[model samples]
Target chain A: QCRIQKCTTDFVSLTSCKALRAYAGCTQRTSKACRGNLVYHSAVLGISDLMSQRNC
Target chain B: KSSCKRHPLYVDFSDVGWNDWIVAPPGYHAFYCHGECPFPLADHLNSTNHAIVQTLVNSVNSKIPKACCVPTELSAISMLYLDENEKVVLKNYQDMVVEGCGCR
Candidate 1:
């Protein structure tokens, strides 16, 4: 069994495109543990929504 | 012995310092899917043939892991947030909620 930290917000306030982009970039921080994990995918889509809204 | 199922998980935009941008619905019910995809999946498990085959392989060789439990169906959510332009707008976000679970 492998262990990987669940996706978490590191207190980055997404008030700007930089922050939002960084938030969405978390998905790129990859690992095998995240495979098939919907929680991670949810965040991927969730942050993507905000980023697109900001047009970042 | 666990089977795939949806679990309640609330994501608070405020908690992550996102409250400033997200206007309406400070948070959302972003439920998660979890559990195990075992061999000989049940009909109700909504497993794909690939998963079924993989499950069989894992059963023979303990090194091979079983199929994963994941969201088989997803739904969208509408949110109010501030764009880079600094205007509040409502938009739809897809795959934000786990509507159903299955083996994959």
Candidate 2:
């Protein structure tokens, strides 16, 4: 979970308008290590859906 | 026992007749999960302890049914479309793809 400490830390910094893109990338980059995990999936769900509503 | 796994369920926009505005990725694999949670729970189901306790109650009384098999993880997809006013709108939709399944 050490590297994921880095990932989660990086998650916090990704609060920009394009934050969802960074989050999507983060999930995929670490997919193999944490594939089919719900915690990450839940995060991806909320932020990406929030990104969807932008400029709508 | 019925299996708890994602199954193929392709949704072609045109075939289902929703191709008016959707662009790119004409079709996507929207897999579904199906299974039956039997009387006794097993770790093989990779179940949470909550499911474990409920399964016991369900075993004694049929009213309390066993847990359902459903999507435990999902992924999203972006689609391009022309909305009202005929403007190009590219948008992302969440939980579009079932990534995993489990008894829950």
Candidate 3:
């Protein structure tokens, strides 16, 4: 989950928390608990881990 | 919110939050911190940054008058804010969760 804003065919798609982790290149070091948190944010709460850096 | 005394201009993209976080569908609540964190500061920073975007938007709008529109290189206005805000928010969230309340 890369936090970098994605520019696609459509408008910019905000990366998911999982995507952000991938973007930060932290997936390997990400803890299971942290990954769970990201899943919770993305699936249950619909919030993203504030760590996913995005622009505008 | 009026700390800057400026009309806040927000970007209403199709589905992305300014921070690039996806909003919980509609009925759900995002559980980060509902506290008075740096939301205002971030908003103001975003507003100031978007001033540059507004300029570009204006440029495009003006170009439309002369039919001189062209896909120019995208500017970093939005990217900078998003990247910085992510760092701030994540750092704050981690501190709060770790300290159990009175963290940075």
Instruction: Output the lDDT of residue B23, model 3.
Output: 33
Q: How many angstroms is residue A21 displaced in model 3 relative to the true structure, after the best TM-score fit?
A: 0.6
Tens-digit per-residue lDDT, B49-83, candidate 3: 33333333443475522112121122222112224
Fnat scores for every prediction: 0.00, 0.00, 0.00
After superposing candidate 3, which stretches have Cα over 4 Å from the reference?
Answer: A1-16, A26-56, B1-47, B50-104
Backbone clashes in model 1: 1
Which of the two candidates, 1 or 2, achieves a greater lDDT against the reference?
A: 1
Writing each residue's lDDT as its tens digit, candidate 2 over B1-104 gives: 65566788999999987787787679889899887754322222445656655655675688987877888889998888887788888899999999988777
Task: Please give the ranking of all candidate structures by TM-score, highest first, separated by commas.
Answer: 1, 2, 3
Candidate 2 per-residue C-alpha lDDT over A32-56 given as tens digits, one digit per residue, 9 for 90 to 100: 7665554444344445555656742
TM-score of each: 0.60, 0.57, 0.14
Q: Put down candidate 3 lDDT per residue, A1-56, tens digits, no spaces.
A: 42212211111133214543443343233334445342222221111324432431
lDDT of 1 at A24: 48
DockQ for each numbered candidate: 0.02, 0.02, 0.02
Ten residues in a row with the worst lDDT in model 3 chain B? Answer: B95-104
What's model 1's lDDT at B62? 81
* Tens-digit lDDT string for candidate 1 (B1-104): 66677899999998989887779898999899888765422223566667766666675688988778788999999999878898889999999999998888
lDDT of 1 by residue, A1-56 (tens): 21212223341222206655554455556535567754444445545555556575
Q: Best candidate per TM-score, number?
A: 1
